[PDB]
Amino acid sequence: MEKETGPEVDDSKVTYDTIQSKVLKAVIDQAFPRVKEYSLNGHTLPGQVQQFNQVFINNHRITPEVTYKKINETTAEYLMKLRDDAHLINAEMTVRLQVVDNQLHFDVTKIVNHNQVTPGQKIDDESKLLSSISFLGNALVSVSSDQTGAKFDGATMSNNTHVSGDDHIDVTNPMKDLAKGYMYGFVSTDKLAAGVWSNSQNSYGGGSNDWTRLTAYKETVGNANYVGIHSSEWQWEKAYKGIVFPEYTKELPSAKVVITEDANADKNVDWQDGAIAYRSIMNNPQGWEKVKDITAYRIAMNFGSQAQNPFLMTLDGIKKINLHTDGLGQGVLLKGYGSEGHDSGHLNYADIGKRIGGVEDFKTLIEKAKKYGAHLGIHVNASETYPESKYFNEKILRKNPDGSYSYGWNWLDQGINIDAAYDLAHGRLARWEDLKKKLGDGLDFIYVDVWGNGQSGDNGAWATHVLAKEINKQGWRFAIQWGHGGEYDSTFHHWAADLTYGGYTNKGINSAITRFIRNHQKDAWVGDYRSYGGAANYPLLGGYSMKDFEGWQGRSDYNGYVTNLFAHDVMTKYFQHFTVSKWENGTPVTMTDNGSTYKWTPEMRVELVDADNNKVVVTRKSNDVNSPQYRERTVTLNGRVIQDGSAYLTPWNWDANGKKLSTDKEKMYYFNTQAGATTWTLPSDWAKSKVYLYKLTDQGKTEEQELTVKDGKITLDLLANQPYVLYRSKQTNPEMSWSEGMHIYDQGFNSGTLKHWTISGDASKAEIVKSQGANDMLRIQGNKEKVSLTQKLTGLKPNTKYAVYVGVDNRSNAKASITVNTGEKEVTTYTNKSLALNYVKAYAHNTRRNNATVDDTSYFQNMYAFFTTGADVSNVTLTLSREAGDEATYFDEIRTFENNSSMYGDKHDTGKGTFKQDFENVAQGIFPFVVGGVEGVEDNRTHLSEKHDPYTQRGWNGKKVDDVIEGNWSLKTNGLVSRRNLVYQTIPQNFRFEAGKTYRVTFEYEAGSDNTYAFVVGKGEFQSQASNLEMHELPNTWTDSKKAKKATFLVTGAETGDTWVGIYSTGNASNTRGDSGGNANFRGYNDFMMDNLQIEEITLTGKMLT
């Protein structure tokens, strides 16, 4: 390539001025808001050397009529009139250039459109709007090839672990063309660096063309190439289908430059110096400060009306984790906080889940959790909804060009995407407001699922920023799914933090530059997942690795969760208490994985600092990719080693909320993924002190042991993958107030004792034991007389109706009971041997081997009593008991909560009388049925359907059957046809068909096809040697009827006491009558709904006999 040339500059008709601070001088054109040149400590950076007196308004080239006025020694102002009648532009804008110490600020302070535009109202011509304002062509800062050390360094979005998003370019003549959007961008010489910020929400496309708030351009001027950094275009007045967006969607354009000398004392001026300084001019995502102390992220799940994780239970999880980490901070994402749970009732953000305890319990959760540094988030959706939802309306739904619905997710119900732009223009904000109003303060984060994939239309930079603003404005912190989403505002990205998702192309932001800048502000990065290669092969800064134990994707592994925290997350978060100061790459390595062989340049040393001048140095132990040392690091704090390879002894001087700890509370964590002794040098403030070590368990600090200090050092030879904590004085564990708010103490058996129960019988027969998932359970076995455990139920309301259940898994034929005595009345419920495996995937006690009760299975099901308090609640008792038996009964989780069911002879309390279920006041699940094994252990596709006329009912979008038969609730099964298996069943503990007694079972039902579903009668444990069922196949309810059909069956209780009834998915094929896809799922061909179940004991007379 030949030495390049361009026009020289004739500034003969230009009148320049200057504005300046004490350190930075800027020469500016009086004709146009352009900076010719910057000067600092006698060094120079050019700006836009070649005048370019145009802008672009709605992509029309405009020569503005400009008037100048210097305001003070640092500030100038420009009024800029904009006229183009051919394109209906008639407006003006005021711009200010202002120097502030070493920063240059560019602000459009004011915009007037002389065309009539009312935000919120119709406009007849969208071209009358002032939509876009572009100052491309006027570089805010640049560097010339004639200057020593001239380079440009910029970041683009990359989520592929193999591909860096960063460009590093020498500015030379000649050099390759450059016209490209960037997220972050820096120019420098050997003397000065500059960085540029803009609030432009410009996009040039997806992927690495998105989040392109800056634009870098090479321009050739005389005999030099210049690389300048411009703000990309800004957005202003916008509409959707003629409706102008709200005023809050308009943000005044703004950009800033910062110019610096060597800022990390490495005696070199480069992009890093600019990145350090850039932190003083950049946007900071709201709530970023909290991130560094949220060490324990996870999800607590509810789904399909089951209430797997009530709000108050979640607080017990928080307390376990508080103990096991010794006060590390926590972030719990409540997936299914609303409606019937996860993927129910979307868009009605304020509809907090009633069956998990509603808003009252949620508030109590948030409040009590503060002291444990536990922040709560919720999973919401702004892209799709279901007919059940209050906000399902035809006007909001997304249609395809041909008029068809753009169908969304299908699982419990078939959803339909919404038009996000339409939603924004029609009151979206108010939904967030309703939630804030209802819930009050203290919620940390909103996690908006799905947004960023285009289901709802445009989900790009502009729309994401508007959305994020709606949420931030209520006081909430923003979180997103995708690695590539909400770059301006997100603090957390699910697909970055859960390393397992998506594979090497869909992880966090693979940009040295971007992580240097914002590592401490968010979890959006590439963590350690060797199989993805490149940046994911042991990043020196770690990167959040998220695991779960409260039901998300069937995850239940508590211990794994805790060992993961210490293995990845403690050091990850440690670094987030500092800002990166220096970043050193080593030599390119070759790697092979995921089908390619490729070059990767790894980071070898990263330094960080804090406001107290503490210095952290992280060093990779080798640059040889095939050496074990490539995946090892040393970390030093002010010169002292705190990690080396597989082990670390890290100080931690922050309580759970991140507050500086008092001196007597400073501590150190030890963790080592290997066996073997490690030896460590203590800091001077520990070296002459006694030192005690504790092993951290779910019981807190254990196994106190004073350590021997020899020559300022300690030596630790302890269990691998086991956390320990070190103090300079003897520590104790506090009272946790287990299950506070839940009317009983320690409902989940996490307190390590039973002393708070009053035990009748041989107490040696009752023990706390661990499931195969290390879930602590009450076990009663080997007992020759009745054994009982009793507590008062405390803090109840007088004259109030209640439900209480206990999870029970009975391996004995012995009666196992739950009994409530209110002081004026006694009620009891029992089970003999359990006969139904648990198949609720988000429930902690499902039958998956790794969280099985015993013998690789779980029959846990909730066993209920229904009672009503009197005038006096001082002496209400709850009793768990077991009659004599050799085998074991396991009990876990006692939940007492308000319920207005009227199931027994039209009365609430457990008693005699006809059993009715209208599904209008279910406590949780699908009682008296429990989900069967038709889909195995799963987010079961049977739930309680909620009514919304007309959208859930016959006729709407051609729907064939009603979601809801009477009242507001029915029992619905979605598309579970042709499975030859049991969908759900009763169980003796929920309803017992007494030996030899005869019952009439009646219900109303809807069914989309003939003989897809059948009412069945069985006994004992069902097996698909398959079990005998009395089978009654059921016809469709709509071809020859306008409403649900009524069915009636006689059932006689087997002598074994273990008769049950249910619904079975036949092997017959369904009939979608020519419909397919979304239409077919929506309209209900493959559906079954039950309502108004009744079971009456009867004596066979007259015609009942025939």
Ligand SMILES: CC(=O)N[C@@H]1[C@@H](O[C@@H]2O[C@H](CO)[C@H](O)[C@H](O)[C@H]2O)[C@@H](O)[C@@H](CO)O[C@@H]1O
């Ligand atoms: C990974 C993730 O967040 N995926 C979202 C989907 O999640 C699934 O939800 C179903 C129940 O509806 C089930 O629990 C699966 O285990 C879970 O992965 C889902 O919420 C959809 C809705 O559009 O969005 C994401 O893909």
Ligand SMILES: [Ca+2]
């Ligand atoms: Ca430097």
Ligand SMILES: [Ca+2]
């Ligand atoms: Ca438990």
Ligand SMILES: [Ca+2]
């Ligand atoms: Ca009903």
Ligand SMILES: [Mn+2]
């Ligand atoms: Mn539903």
